[PDB]
Enzyme design. Sequence first.
Site, PDB file in Angstrom:
ATOM      1  N   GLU A  39       0.833  -1.193   0.000  1.00  0.00           N
ATOM      2  CA  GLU A  39       0.000   0.000   0.000  1.00  0.00           C
ATOM      3  C   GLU A  39       0.872   1.249   0.000  1.00  0.00           C
ATOM      4  O   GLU A  39       1.808   1.366   0.800  1.00  0.00           O
ATOM      5  CB  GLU A  39      -0.935   0.060   1.209  1.00  0.00           C
ATOM      6  CG  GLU A  39      -1.371   1.510   1.502  1.00  0.00           C
ATOM      7  CD  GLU A  39      -2.508   1.641   2.495  1.00  0.00           C
ATOM      8  OE1 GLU A  39      -3.427   2.446   2.227  1.00  0.00           O
ATOM      9  OE2 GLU A  39      -2.473   0.968   3.546  1.00  0.00           O
ATOM     10  N   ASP A 104       8.676   6.295  15.301  1.00  0.00           N
ATOM     11  CA  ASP A 104       8.452   7.713  15.022  1.00  0.00           C
ATOM     12  C   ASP A 104       8.669   8.461  16.324  1.00  0.00           C
ATOM     13  O   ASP A 104       7.954   8.221  17.302  1.00  0.00           O
ATOM     14  CB  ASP A 104       7.039   7.958  14.469  1.00  0.00           C
ATOM     15  CG  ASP A 104       6.638   9.446  14.432  1.00  0.00           C
ATOM     16  OD1 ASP A 104       7.453  10.315  14.053  1.00  0.00           O
ATOM     17  OD2 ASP A 104       5.465   9.732  14.752  1.00  0.00           O
ATOM     18  N   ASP A 106       9.006  12.251  18.126  1.00  0.00           N
ATOM     19  CA  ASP A 106       8.571  13.631  17.952  1.00  0.00           C
ATOM     20  C   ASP A 106       9.134  14.469  19.092  1.00  0.00           C
ATOM     21  O   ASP A 106       8.899  14.160  20.264  1.00  0.00           O
ATOM     22  CB  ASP A 106       7.039  13.720  17.920  1.00  0.00           C
ATOM     23  CG  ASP A 106       6.422  13.009  16.711  1.00  0.00           C
ATOM     24  OD1 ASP A 106       7.071  12.969  15.647  1.00  0.00           O
ATOM     25  OD2 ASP A 106       5.284  12.497  16.827  1.00  0.00           O
TER      26      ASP A 106
HETATM   27  N1  LIG Z   1      -4.450  11.324   9.804  1.00  0.00           N
HETATM   28  C1  LIG Z   1      -3.579  10.342   9.547  1.00  0.00           C
HETATM   29  N2  LIG Z   1      -4.063   9.199   9.014  1.00  0.00           N
HETATM   30  C2  LIG Z   1      -3.201   8.238   8.766  1.00  0.00           C
HETATM   31  F1  LIG Z   1      -3.748   7.137   8.241  1.00  0.00           F
HETATM   32  N3  LIG Z   1      -1.902   8.165   8.941  1.00  0.00           N
HETATM   33  C3  LIG Z   1      -1.451   9.309   9.469  1.00  0.00           C
HETATM   34  C4  LIG Z   1      -2.202  10.422   9.796  1.00  0.00           C
HETATM   35  N4  LIG Z   1      -1.398  11.423  10.322  1.00  0.00           N
HETATM   36  C5  LIG Z   1      -0.197  10.897  10.301  1.00  0.00           C
HETATM   37  N5  LIG Z   1      -0.158   9.614   9.817  1.00  0.00           N
HETATM   38  C6  LIG Z   1       1.035   8.801   9.645  1.00  0.00           C
HETATM   39  O1  LIG Z   1       1.756   8.802  10.863  1.00  0.00           O
HETATM   40  C7  LIG Z   1       3.110   9.232  10.623  1.00  0.00           C
HETATM   41  C8  LIG Z   1       3.637   9.937  11.845  1.00  0.00           C
HETATM   42  O2  LIG Z   1       2.856  11.133  12.055  1.00  0.00           O
HETATM   43  P1  LIG Z   1       3.546  12.526  12.391  1.00  0.00           P
HETATM   44  O3  LIG Z   1       4.567  12.286  13.525  1.00  0.00           O
HETATM   45  O4  LIG Z   1       2.595  13.594  12.745  1.00  0.00           O
HETATM   46  O5  LIG Z   1       4.337  12.978  11.084  1.00  0.00           O
HETATM   47  P2  LIG Z   1       5.863  12.881  10.647  1.00  0.00           P
HETATM   48  O6  LIG Z   1       6.651  12.077  11.718  1.00  0.00           O
HETATM   49  O7  LIG Z   1       5.926  12.307   9.299  1.00  0.00           O
HETATM   50  O8  LIG Z   1       6.418  14.369  10.568  1.00  0.00           O
HETATM   51  P3  LIG Z   1       6.801  15.356  11.756  1.00  0.00           P
HETATM   52  O9  LIG Z   1       5.952  16.542  11.667  1.00  0.00           O
HETATM   53  O10 LIG Z   1       6.589  14.584  13.031  1.00  0.00           O
HETATM   54  O11 LIG Z   1       8.276  15.650  11.591  1.00  0.00           O
HETATM   55  C9  LIG Z   1       3.020  10.093   9.379  1.00  0.00           C
HETATM   56  O12 LIG Z   1       4.257  10.112   8.684  1.00  0.00           O
HETATM   57  C10 LIG Z   1       1.946   9.380   8.557  1.00  0.00           C
HETATM   58  O13 LIG Z   1       2.449   8.352   7.712  1.00  0.00           O
HETATM   59 MN   LIG Z   2       4.052  11.165  15.574  1.00  0.00          MN
HETATM   60 MN   LIG Z   3       6.813  12.390  13.667  1.00  0.00          MN
END
Ligand SMILES: Nc1nc(F)nc2c1ncn2[C@@H]1O[C@H](COP(=O)(O)OP(=O)(O)OP(=O)(O)O)[C@@H](O)[C@H]1O
Ligand SMILES: [Mn+2]
Ligand SMILES: [Mn+2]
Length: 383
Positions: A39, A104, A106
Amino acid sequence: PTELPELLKLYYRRLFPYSQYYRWLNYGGVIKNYFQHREFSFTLKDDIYIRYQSFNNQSDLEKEMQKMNPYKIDIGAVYSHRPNQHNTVKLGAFQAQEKELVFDIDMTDYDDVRRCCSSADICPKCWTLMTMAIRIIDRALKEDFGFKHRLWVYSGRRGVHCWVCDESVRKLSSAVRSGIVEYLSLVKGGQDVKKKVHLSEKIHPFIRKSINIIKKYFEEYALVNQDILENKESWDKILALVPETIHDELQQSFQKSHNSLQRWEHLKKVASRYQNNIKNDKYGPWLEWEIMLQYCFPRLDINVSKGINHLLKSPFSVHPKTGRISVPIDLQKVDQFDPFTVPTISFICRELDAITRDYKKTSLAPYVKVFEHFLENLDKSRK
Ligand SMILES: Nc1nc(F)nc2c1ncn2[C@@H]1O[C@H](COP(=O)(O)OP(=O)(O)OP(=O)(O)O)[C@@H](O)[C@H]1O
Ligand SMILES: [Mn+2]
Ligand SMILES: [Mn+2]
Ligand SMILES: [Zn+2]
């Protein structure tokens, strides 16, 4: 935010490293349909996104990405059927089967122990938290669990990702993934809980080795850059983590000391003299360790790791809120990593045509080389 479509079109036409990307997710082509059953999820304009995209091969992926020019690309699991056919599969049979074990992290999750930044902000005075997280988690994954194929990535705004890609790791159940997360976790409790770390009398080797990593950074990071005992408003947060019966003594020493370095040495001496159990005459640095761990130990976004279906932002995807490319991190240079040198899509598009047209002419090149070193190890592993 309106400049992105024009820049994304050039990025996906000339800069995105498709051949390396497919080498990754095709995993040598040994298993039938492994790439075709992956996916992908694309985010388009206006926060609109599409689940359960899948592609036949590298050319198909290139064509669709260049047609749709997504703002963001997320990678999901490998399924039992082609994701883009899931409506033709009898209900119940469409099931996630394999996915990388991912993490992940943050920086926002550290706001209670950061003084320089809050929310999605990061800066060089707190980025060391990520340096310590990488070192602690990667050591455990490599040494304690024996996982050999680990890709660390800058998320593009506020932290880092890890993709653990060993073939048996990819088969792990959600229950086992949860167990791994628990093994790696020590900081527990929401904002309602003041003291988030509690250690047992005999510390497990994972905890000892993690403490020793923090000890290498704690002085420069916590005592100088964060100045966690600068003044009473700062050092009161630390007193909230130790027993009241030693507050008075520590209060007086802190006021008689001149800087955080001196106040920390006094805390360690008092803490190693505190009597926890009145039965025994046993003393130790448990309190000192619990403070260092609460301020420096990795805080994982756990839900990202536990579910086999969970999406995670792709390496070499843009982060739409910053324009930064999610780039691999070179583990041999983790202490040198500067998130503010990470190229934005605007920056490499400007490089590409400033006076062949591919990423080697841009600042993206060294990050693709890190990616290729990780792909070569995967290739060797399959011999
Ligand atoms: N609504 C959402 N529905 C679904 F299905 N997946 C989501 C959503 N929101 C996020 N995801 C995934 O969950 C990861 C970590 O979410 P997040 O920590 O906020 O983003 P990032 O680490 O990428 O970026 P940063 O700002 O943290 O640097 C992201 O990559 C996405 O694949
Ligand atoms: Mn996160
Ligand atoms: Mn993140
Ligand atoms: Zn900061």
